[PDB]
Amino acid sequence: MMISEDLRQKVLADAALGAGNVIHRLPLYGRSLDEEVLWLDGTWRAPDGSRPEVLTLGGLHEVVAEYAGFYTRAGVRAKDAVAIVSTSITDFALNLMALTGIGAIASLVNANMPAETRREYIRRQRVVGIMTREPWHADLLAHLDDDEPPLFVALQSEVEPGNREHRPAAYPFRHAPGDPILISHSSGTIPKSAFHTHETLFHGALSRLADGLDCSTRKRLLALPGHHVSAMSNTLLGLTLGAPVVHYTDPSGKAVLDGIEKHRPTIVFGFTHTFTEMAAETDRDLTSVEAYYASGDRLLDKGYHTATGPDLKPKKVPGAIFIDMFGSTEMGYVLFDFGRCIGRPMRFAQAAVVGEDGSVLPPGQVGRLGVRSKSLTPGFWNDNVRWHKQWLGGYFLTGDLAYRDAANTFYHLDRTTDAIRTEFVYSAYTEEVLLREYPEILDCTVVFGWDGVATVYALVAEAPQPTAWINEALGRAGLPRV
Amino acid sequence: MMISEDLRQKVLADAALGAGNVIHRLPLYGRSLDEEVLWLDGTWRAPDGSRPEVLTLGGLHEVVAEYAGFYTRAGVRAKDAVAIVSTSITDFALNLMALTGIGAIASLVNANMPAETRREYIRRQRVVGIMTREPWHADLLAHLDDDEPPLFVALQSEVEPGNREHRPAAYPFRHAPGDPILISHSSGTIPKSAFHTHETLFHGALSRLADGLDCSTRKRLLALPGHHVSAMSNTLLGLTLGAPVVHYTDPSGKAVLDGIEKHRPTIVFGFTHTFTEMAAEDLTDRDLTSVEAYYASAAHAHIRRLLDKGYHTATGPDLKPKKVPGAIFIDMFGSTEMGYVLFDFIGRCIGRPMRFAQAAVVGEDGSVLPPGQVGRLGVRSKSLTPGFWNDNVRWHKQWLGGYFLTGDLAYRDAANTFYHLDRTTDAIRTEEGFVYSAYTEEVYPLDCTVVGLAVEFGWEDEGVATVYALVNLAEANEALGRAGLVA
Amino acid sequence: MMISEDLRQKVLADAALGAGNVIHRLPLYGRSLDEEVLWLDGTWRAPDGSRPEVLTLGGLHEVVAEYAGFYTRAGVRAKDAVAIVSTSITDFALNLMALTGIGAIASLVNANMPAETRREYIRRQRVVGIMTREPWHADLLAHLDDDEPPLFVALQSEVEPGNREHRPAAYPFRHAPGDPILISHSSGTIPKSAFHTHETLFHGALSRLADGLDCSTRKRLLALPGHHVSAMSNTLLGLTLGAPVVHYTDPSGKAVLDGIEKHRPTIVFGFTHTFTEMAAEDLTDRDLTSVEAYYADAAHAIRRLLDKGYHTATGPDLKPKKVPGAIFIDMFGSTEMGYVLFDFVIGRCIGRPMRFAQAAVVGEDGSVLPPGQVGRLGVRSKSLTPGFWNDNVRWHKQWLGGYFLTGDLAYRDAANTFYHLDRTTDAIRTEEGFVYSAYTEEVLLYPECTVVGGWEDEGVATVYALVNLNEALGRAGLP
Amino acid sequence: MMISEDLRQKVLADAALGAGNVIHRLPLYGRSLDEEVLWLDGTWRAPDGSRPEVLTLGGLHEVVAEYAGFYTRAGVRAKDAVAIVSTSITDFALNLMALTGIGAIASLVNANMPAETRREYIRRQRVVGIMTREPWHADLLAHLDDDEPPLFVALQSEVEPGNREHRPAAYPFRHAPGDPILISHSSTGIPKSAFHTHETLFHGALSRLADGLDCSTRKRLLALPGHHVSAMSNTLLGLTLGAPVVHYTDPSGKAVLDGIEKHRPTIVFGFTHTFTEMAAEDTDRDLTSVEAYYASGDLDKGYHTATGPDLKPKKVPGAIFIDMFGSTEMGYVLFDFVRCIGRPMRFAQAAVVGEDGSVLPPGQVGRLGVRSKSLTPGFWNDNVRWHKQWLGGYFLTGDLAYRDAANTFYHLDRTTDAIRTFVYSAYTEEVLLREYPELDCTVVGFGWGVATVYALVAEAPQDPTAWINEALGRAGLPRV
Ligand SMILES: Nc1ncnc2c1ncn2[C@@H]1O[C@H](COP(=O)(O)OP(=O)(O)OP(=O)(O)O)[C@@H](O)[C@H]1O
Ligand SMILES: Nc1ncnc2c1ncn2[C@@H]1O[C@H](COP(=O)(O)OP(=O)(O)OP(=O)(O)O)[C@@H](O)[C@H]1O
Ligand SMILES: Nc1ncnc2c1ncn2[C@@H]1O[C@H](COP(=O)(O)OP(=O)(O)OP(=O)(O)O)[C@@H](O)[C@H]1O
Ligand SMILES: [Mg+2]
Ligand SMILES: [Mg+2]
Ligand SMILES: [Mg+2]
Numbered sequence A: 001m002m003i004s005e006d007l008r009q010k011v012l013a014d015a016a017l018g019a020g021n022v023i024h025r026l027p028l029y030g031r032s033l034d035e036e037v038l039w040l041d042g043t044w045r046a047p048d049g050s051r052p053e054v055l056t057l058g059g060l061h062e063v064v065a066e067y068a069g070f071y072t073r074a075g076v077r078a079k080d081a082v083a084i085v086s087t088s089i090t091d092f093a094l095n096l097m098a099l100t101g102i103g104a105i106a107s108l109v110n111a112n113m114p115a116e117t118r119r120e121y122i123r124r125q126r127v128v129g130i131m132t133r134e135p136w137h138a139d140l141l142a143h144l145d146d147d148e149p150p151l152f153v154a155l156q157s158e159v160e161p162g163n164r165e166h167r168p169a170a171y172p173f174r175h176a177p178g179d180p181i182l183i184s185h186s187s188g189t190i191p192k193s194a195f196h197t198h199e200t201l202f203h204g205a206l207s208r209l210a211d212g213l214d215c216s217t218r219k220r221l222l223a224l225p226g227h228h229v230s231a232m233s234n235t236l237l238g239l240t241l242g243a244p245v246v247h248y249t250d251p252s253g254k255a256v257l258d259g260i261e262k263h264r265p266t267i268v269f270g271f272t273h274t275f276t277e278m279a280a281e282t283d284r285d286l287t288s289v290e291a292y293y294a295s296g297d298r299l300l301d302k303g304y305h306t307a308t309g310p311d312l313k314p315k316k317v318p319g320a321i322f323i324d325m326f327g328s329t330e331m332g333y334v335l336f337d338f339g340r341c342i343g344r345p346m347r348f349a350q351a352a353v354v355g356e357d358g359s360v361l362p363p364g365q366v367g368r369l370g371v372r373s374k375s376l377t378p379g380f381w382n383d384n385v386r387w388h389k390q391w392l393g394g395y396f397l398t399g400d401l402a403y404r405d406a407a408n409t410f411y412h413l414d415r416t417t418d419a420i421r422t423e424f425v426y427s428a429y430t431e432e433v434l435l436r437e438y439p440e441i442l443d444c445t446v447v448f449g450w451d452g453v454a455t456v457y458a459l460v461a462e463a464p465q466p467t468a469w470i471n472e473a474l475g476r477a478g479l480p481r482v
Numbered sequence B: 001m002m003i004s005e006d007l008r009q010k011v012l013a014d015a016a017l018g019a020g021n022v023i024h025r026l027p028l029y030g031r032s033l034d035e036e037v038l039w040l041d042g043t044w045r046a047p048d049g050s051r052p053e054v055l056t057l058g059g060l061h062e063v064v065a066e067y068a069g070f071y072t073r074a075g076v077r078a079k080d081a082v083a084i085v086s087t088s089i090t091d092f093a094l095n096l097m098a099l100t101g102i103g104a105i106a107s108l109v110n111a112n113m114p115a116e117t118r119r120e121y122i123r124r125q126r127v128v129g130i131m132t133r134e135p136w137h138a139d140l141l142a143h144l145d146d147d148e149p150p151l152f153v154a155l156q157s158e159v160e161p162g163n164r165e166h167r168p169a170a171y172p173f174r175h176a177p178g179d180p181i182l183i184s185h186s187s188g189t190i191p192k193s194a195f196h197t198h199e200t201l202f203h204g205a206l207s208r209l210a211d212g213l214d215c216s217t218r219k220r221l222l223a224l225p226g227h228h229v230s231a232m233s234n235t236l237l238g239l240t241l242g243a244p245v246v247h248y249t250d251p252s253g254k255a256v257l258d259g260i261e262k263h264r265p266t267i268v269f270g271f272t273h274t275f276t277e278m279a280a281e282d283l284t285d286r287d288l289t290s291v292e293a294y295y296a297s298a299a300h301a302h303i304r305r306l307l308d309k310g311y312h313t314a315t316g317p318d319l320k321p322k323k324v325p326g327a328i329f330i331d332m333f334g335s336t337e338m339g340y341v342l343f344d345f346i347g348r349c350i351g352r353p354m355r356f357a358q359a360a361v362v363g364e365d366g367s368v369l370p371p372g373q374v375g376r377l378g379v380r381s382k383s384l385t386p387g388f389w390n391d392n393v394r395w396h397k398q399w400l401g402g403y404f405l406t407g408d409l410a411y412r413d414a415a416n417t418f419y420h421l422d423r424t425t426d427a428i429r430t431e432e433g434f435v436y437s438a439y440t441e442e443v444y445p446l447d448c449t450v451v452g453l454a455v456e457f458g459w460e461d462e463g464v465a466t467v468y469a470l471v472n473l474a475e476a477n478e479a480l481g482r483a484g485l486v487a
Numbered sequence C: 001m002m003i004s005e006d007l008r009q010k011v012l013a014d015a016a017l018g019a020g021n022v023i024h025r026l027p028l029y030g031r032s033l034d035e036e037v038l039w040l041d042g043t044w045r046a047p048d049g050s051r052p053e054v055l056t057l058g059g060l061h062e063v064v065a066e067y068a069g070f071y072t073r074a075g076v077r078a079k080d081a082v083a084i085v086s087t088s089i090t091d092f093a094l095n096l097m098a099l100t101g102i103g104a105i106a107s108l109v110n111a112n113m114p115a116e117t118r119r120e121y122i123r124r125q126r127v128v129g130i131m132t133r134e135p136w137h138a139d140l141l142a143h144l145d146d147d148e149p150p151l152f153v154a155l156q157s158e159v160e161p162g163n164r165e166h167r168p169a170a171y172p173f174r175h176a177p178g179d180p181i182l183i184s185h186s187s188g189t190i191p192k193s194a195f196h197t198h199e200t201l202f203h204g205a206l207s208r209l210a211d212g213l214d215c216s217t218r219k220r221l222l223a224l225p226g227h228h229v230s231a232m233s234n235t236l237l238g239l240t241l242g243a244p245v246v247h248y249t250d251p252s253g254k255a256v257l258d259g260i261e262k263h264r265p266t267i268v269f270g271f272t273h274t275f276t277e278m279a280a281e282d283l284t285d286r287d288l289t290s291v292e293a294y295y296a297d298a299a300h301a302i303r304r305l306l307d308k309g310y311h312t313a314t315g316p317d318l319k320p321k322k323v324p325g326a327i328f329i330d331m332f333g334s335t336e337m338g339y340v341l342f343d344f345v346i347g348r349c350i351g352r353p354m355r356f357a358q359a360a361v362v363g364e365d366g367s368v369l370p371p372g373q374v375g376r377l378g379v380r381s382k383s384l385t386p387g388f389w390n391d392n393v394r395w396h397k398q399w400l401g402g403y404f405l406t407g408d409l410a411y412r413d414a415a416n417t418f419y420h421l422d423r424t425t426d427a428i429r430t431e432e433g434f435v436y437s438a439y440t441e442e443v444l445l446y447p448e449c450t451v452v453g454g455w456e457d458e459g460v461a462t463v464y465a466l467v468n469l470n471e472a473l474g475r476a477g478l479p
Numbered sequence D: 001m002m003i004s005e006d007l008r009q010k011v012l013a014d015a016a017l018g019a020g021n022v023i024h025r026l027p028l029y030g031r032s033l034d035e036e037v038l039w040l041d042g043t044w045r046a047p048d049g050s051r052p053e054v055l056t057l058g059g060l061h062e063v064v065a066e067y068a069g070f071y072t073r074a075g076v077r078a079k080d081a082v083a084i085v086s087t088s089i090t091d092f093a094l095n096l097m098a099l100t101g102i103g104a105i106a107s108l109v110n111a112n113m114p115a116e117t118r119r120e121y122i123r124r125q126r127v128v129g130i131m132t133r134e135p136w137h138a139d140l141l142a143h144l145d146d147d148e149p150p151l152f153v154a155l156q157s158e159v160e161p162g163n164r165e166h167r168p169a170a171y172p173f174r175h176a177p178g179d180p181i182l183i184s185h186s187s188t189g190i191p192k193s194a195f196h197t198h199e200t201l202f203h204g205a206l207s208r209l210a211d212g213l214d215c216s217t218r219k220r221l222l223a224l225p226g227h228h229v230s231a232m233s234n235t236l237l238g239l240t241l242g243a244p245v246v247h248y249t250d251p252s253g254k255a256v257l258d259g260i261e262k263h264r265p266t267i268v269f270g271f272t273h274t275f276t277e278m279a280a281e282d283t284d285r286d287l288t289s290v291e292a293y294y295a296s297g298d299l300d301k302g303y304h305t306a307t308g309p310d311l312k313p314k315k316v317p318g319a320i321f322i323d324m325f326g327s328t329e330m331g332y333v334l335f336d337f338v339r340c341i342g343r344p345m346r347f348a349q350a351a352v353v354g355e356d357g358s359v360l361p362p363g364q365v366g367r368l369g370v371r372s373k374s375l376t377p378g379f380w381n382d383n384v385r386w387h388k389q390w391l392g393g394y395f396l397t398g399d400l401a402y403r404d405a406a407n408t409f410y411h412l413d414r415t416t417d418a419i420r421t422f423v424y425s426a427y428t429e430e431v432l433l434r435e436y437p438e439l440d441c442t443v444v445g446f447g448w449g450v451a452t453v454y455a456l457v458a459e460a461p462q463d464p465t466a467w468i469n470e471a472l473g474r475a476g477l478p479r480v
């Protein structure tokens, strides 16, 4: 369902509400502190020592209050950065609600980040403290010998019942629109660190709630990367809408086929890989799901979805929705909803297929995807050098090459770094045609860029004799050939 | 083709630019005065006595100067309203350009307005002046017996070579964003008076251009009704773009077929009534291939006959341009209150809200409705009218829940795509639910009218009725059955 | 004393709050219904037949509920304008709360508007209803012969205990920022009808409060004309701040000197004439020590009243220091202004523009003039009226250069301090220069007046002084 | 004089105008490239080897196009930062006008910054190249051994006639509102490096022009610190209004008295000190040209126009003294008064903030805080000290103050300088320099733990402590 007129107006009239104070406002809207709101997978160990399967609004306020005082006692003050090295969406979200209540910044770090690289990334942030769990803690104590070290490398088990008494007197913190609440990192291709504020992280959400969109009470299962800006924006968003949120730390398509069947969620958030794993695996009940929300680089037919019939009345079409979202850590929210089509920019965002001089390119020509929005990061942490340089012509270059039609429908063709000059070859597009001409094809990778010419070569039941096989798909379709 | 970056940046850097100074600014961008800007129907008598078929930047700037001065000598001062009573896109355009230079307001009035209604409509505006032509001038002198009478009921022929000497010394005016430039009117259903400002009438154009949209140089044939804000909006806009504009006073399908063949426009603005007329013609060896887009502005429209005689550029799998058969059809959603289109694309799909616009399906209390639920179409946009000339009573009554009600009932898919069902007034209640006459009508491939009859049965009116289908056509409710959905 | 951080943050975090729902928000901030909020002066008769001397938040919400219902039963609907014809800040203030609750607009009309003009002023608003009292009701029935006649001409006595049941179910209305709440009218010089919205009428108040200004809890005595927009905003604003508001229907110097003694207010709002009169009394056995600020108006004015007071200052110890005499703020306003745009020698200093306002001295082509040059005062603000009701003709004609001409001529110093000289219409051209009547009157006022004899008309003239009781002109430097 | 209606409208209708395109737009408004626009003190060497005494618009555009190509050839690309290490307002301004058109950031560094610290400041910034002059260059070549080194530590003589050909084809650069143009630095610890953009650096200026303020054609003499945000805004501002700008690199009260006598300027910009030293000089000096002195940081021989009772102008004696409150991070001045700081200017919002950040009531003492789109968007490469400088939604300026009911602020002290007993040092100091005409005072002492205050300042006293203390007693303050 969609939220009531009552909650919408309460939300849109709360000039204070933002990513940094979401749970402390929910009581004031009238929610009961006994209601169940956030459903856990079992990985998360509570301070009393338990492993809760569900938290209520009040329980989450005391879990968050517990971690909060532990930090304020360990010495965390406002505007202080805390590096959080875990892999549990539940881990990051609770530390962010706590650290935000004390006015601090929860710098989320995926523990699996390549080790020698994680050290430079955390080192560069100058955080006053690290918090982690037992699997990575022994290595993170190296950071205590950093020129400017963290005050502490702690474990979550160090947060014990009653630590909340040390929480500050003016709790919770009163955020200003611009007060940082988070720092996230890029995924691969020295990760770039972007910080997010009380306002930018919820700018897209509320902008959508205001148009009458993305404002359902439907149960959502969040099996996203736990460190990623969206896992936090959707755990924060669902709680705000009153939508039962469910955290799954298992990215396996098979664990999410259990989760879909166990929790029977109406919508399911994950990355493309997760939905793929799900797609390869008849006797599964995916009846509850009406929409899959994906993001990053055929389970649909086992579902259903509501539409408007010619009677101008609801219909229960068969199959669920697959929504390919285009996002980044630095993009804050999603800026588009739908070659490979990304869709039209949403009303609180501006988009351009930019040129090398930065001039908006006309429709149909290929260029750098560029965007603008107050949902966007205000900058790279401690690194003004790289940031101002990732902008061209007034747009934030997202790092992808694309083109657009007259409606401003955009299509991702390739990564800028991945396009090849060959007397040009956008590989993600080139890859996709092959998986579409030759169904048998499970995977493809097409290999002088945006510098000089080169040559391109494929990487894909039976086999061919090779080039001649693939090169027939390209010829029919009209593309340069390997 | 798209305008150059050099021009785009100049427009987007011209904080001064708006609906009220378009022609006074193009020179400053580098436009040559010798250059041609405007192609005419041959129906306009110029001050020289001529009926020129094309005006240059410099000559329009000349002809505008004359009307401008003629007005300044008749006593028109800044912020004054002047009714233009005509039936010619071209007349409305030249008086509008002129009044704006002296700081004045051109109240467009369709002369074909019923007389006593048109008399009521102008009387309410309290204008200092009417300018019309001989077809209506004799009747318009009645307004000289209004309690607050216009200073003059003039004729266009009265504007003579050399009248420009009387225009003011600071010509051209220096408009404020909020300065009225124009007043438009609705179509019965007394019309409402929407006033548009130097900002509202250009907020939508410039916003889109900023995104790299609706900003091509292609030759446009504007056979729109001259008195609509849409006719003036696109006229001015093309001038701004460097796009060849072509005014046609004859909206007939045969007339426009000639213009398409004569001028070979890339895009054509007209009303559904015009595009339908064209589609009922041989069109065997009519060359309508120049056109890639037909732009409409309730007539619902065989149009596919016309589209198929065209082409449209697309991006193929070679990732390079590709000529494709058939031209585009854009049914834009428009009203007086909207100085641009707000929507871009089961039901007449109106489109998706445009970045500078906000749209909602609203309940009777003004509560945003969920998708699939049927309500009143509502909007918000800095392109909208700031209000009805001399009528805050009617203006405010049109706002519900914070949205401006367009008078049309609708629903929107979960993608925020809006689909028109009916005008709020035309819908019939039955003991089995609501019947939307516009949806039934367009729902057995001449005319239809799903009227109904019985009592009060309207969106607001509680009380049921029964529906009846009135079919034109000839060898005379089972099609209703063929798709969901009369006695 | 300043409002608490807890209230400030609640107000500043309340995206919904505006002139049209001030009381409906106060509870949600935590105010008690039992608390007293509005102190009246015995002129107003309540629905149950009383003449209460104070109202509580809960009881004001009850009185407003009744008027609202009575109107909702008479047929008044949302975006429907209703003329309120009275002379009482309390009448207007109460009808204004009720109409907003149903989403309607209240057109404040001062009954003492000359009849033949007052009829034209109401006719030009096409209201669905008039509400008034016995003094004027029989005459106001002429509007029943208007071509578009009000649905009803009612008396306030018709509002009976229990009419509140008829109010709408969704009471109270939910205002949009742009939703009209109020119409005010100009003195005359037909008056212009300026309409104010849920947003504009509080746009200034809220701007000021964000800054930590114009936000004290001090008790305030409003002896302003009830029909002026500022009389309603200052009422509305005081309730918002939690400050005891006190309505006085009598603007006479005696009545207000009595009120100051009875209620011992910290600040007093009135028109200049009110304050001049108080200054002419004995002021010997009077007690005006409570007052630290007089808030005032083409009438000039009174150091007697000020010396009977005090004002807190910062001493060289960096600590509070009560000092003799109370403050006088000679504020500049019009119907169109909404809030005050200027925060207060050669001329009547107008003050400095406030953060949410822009002011300019413009020429006849609308150009910005330099400091020291004389021109027409012009302004811009989100507090200003968005237009004249049913008069776009008159409205657009008051703008020059992007600015709203306030109808006055002025100059400003290099500090963008503006000084009023005269109303554009009162200035006299002469073979030797321009003469500003308000400045000249002021200068002359030898402590023992009217300078007469145009700004747009190129004709020269001669000027003459009329006293009631040219060497003084020379002394000060004038012609 | 005020600028014309024509320039005002032209400027206010240039949505492209900002700090990074100031001279490239001035031709478009209709200025002649033959006009003289910028007056120099003689200490500047031109590419040809000349030391010009005045530059024209086109001459500025050629000298600017020169450095641009030398920089564009040396390998500087857009959004790239260049540390400029000098002491000359002319040095910094010419390099900033140039880099801006190449799209690069002119990171202004005062060469006299303590040495080992100016090393750590430049090394943190990670610049692509250094530019300096012979007096300091030999030391700046050390930065070539830093972990992430500069492409070039170059000298200004390396920019030679004809380098302008190497400028890019798309020149000048098209700035976006948020594109960086400058990095300036503070003056109580490792200086903070604040970056400024094409919109923030010029936001106050144009906001004032819009209200009809700070828009004169009057000749102005800029003897400000060459590296300071001020010295750049008034230069760009002077060029924009059409006012003859004049650079004096000598901050001595005597050198400006020579400058005010030689150039007869209408207004004079400097820091508090230059005007003070100037006060101890002379009588037989002609400062009649001057009607206003503009100061920042930390008279009877002139005239000023006022409005007389005839409502006609009146040349009064003595020039105006305007004590402005600004900082590198504040971008523009946010307060004006003619220690009263004045009222915030319309484009600025200010508060005396508590320790919880709550707007304090009038009369109580707190941290000075402000908000404006003129403010810097952050400290270069340092999002850690940046957010920590904000409290309650405000940017703490570093000063303690209080305000009256009009929002007139009075600076009392720097926050670091107030001693608990509480005694605001700058206020106490001035109190004593007013009871006793004397030289200069400095009150020391537990800051914002208790302490005891002591003093530091023609006859001499026996009990200097008995003395000073009667001033305080009468005045009403804690005693030393
Ligand atoms: N694309 C469209 N699809 C459906 N209806 C449309 C479309 N464009 C316009 N309309 C119709 O045209 C109307 C706009 O007409 P206009 O504003 O000129 O006057 P009116 O609405 O007929 O008269 P009145 O304003 O008195 O009600 C819309 O309200 C709608 O009914
Ligand atoms: N502080 C003040 N000093 C001097 N005059 C003031 C001051 N405040 C208000 N006024 C005068 O009061 C006027 C306010 O206008 P108001 O709306 O009350 O009616 P009006 O202007 O007299 O009527 P009309 O608009 O019909 O001429 C100002 O234009 C100005 O002349
Ligand atoms: N008008 C003024 N009155 C009093 N003090 C002022 C005034 N203007 C500036 N100051 C003082 O000088 C400072 C101006 O900033 P500046 O650019 O000199 O760097 P800074 O503040 O000295 O930096 P840091 O203290 O971090 O080294 C203000 O912070 C304030 O302490
Ligand atoms: Mg990736
Ligand atoms: Mg990237
Ligand atoms: Mg309509």
Ligand SMILES: [Mg+2]
Binding pocket: C039, C219, C244, C246, C262, C263, C264
């Ligand atoms: Mg009392």
Ligand SMILES: [Mg+2]
Binding pocket: C186, C334, C406, C407
């Ligand atoms: Mg007035």
Ligand SMILES: [Mg+2]
Binding pocket: D186, D187, D327, D397, D398
């Ligand atoms: Mg400092």
